[PDB]
Design a protein around this ligand. Structure first.
Ligand code: THP
Ligand code: CA
Length: 129
């Protein structure tokens, strides 16, 4: 896989971020995780965590996997990186997202994220508490 540039337009919630990619605006949905909706327990915390991470970053990148690049709603499906740190990993490691929506052929970083989830779960962090 390869990283490509993008720029923040707007943090939306824990696992969706509006970004300018190839010069066009689009809502990205993070591959391989599920954050709580804003109205659910840990939702505002998840939104807050993603917001800070993307807003504070000097450099945002997107990394499509080997399969589907858009979902049925027109959202882009990618891993997102903030100054080289994967957003998914950071969220999962903090117990603010679950590994989720693991579909065949768009699952390259599954085991990395599972490892992080196991460590969050061990520490009984946030969703795991
Ligand atoms: C993460 C992801 C979600 N989706 C779709 C499945 C879910 O369909 P349904 O809306 O029909 O439940 C929806 C969940 O996204 P949200 O968690 O953003 O709601 O997004 C994909 O199709 N591919 C993906 O990689
Ligand atoms: Ca969600």
């Amino acid at each position: 896989l390869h990283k490509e540039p993008a720029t923040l337009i707007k943090a939306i919630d824990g696992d969706t971020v509006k970004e300018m990619y190839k010069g066009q605006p689009m809502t990205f949905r993070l591959l391989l995780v599920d954050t709580p909706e804003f109205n659910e327990k840990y939702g505002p915390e998840a939104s807050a965590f993603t917001k800070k991470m993307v807003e504070n970053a000097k450099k945002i990148e997107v990394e499509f996997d080997k399969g589907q690049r858009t979902d049925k709603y027109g959202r882009g499906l990618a891993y997102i990186y903030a100054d080289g740190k994967m957003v998914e990993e950071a969220l999962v490691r903090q117990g603010l997202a679950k590994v989720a929506y693991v579909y065949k052929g768009n699952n390259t970083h599954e085991q990395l994220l599972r490892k992080a989830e196991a460590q969050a779960k061990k520490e009984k962090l946030n969703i795991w508490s």
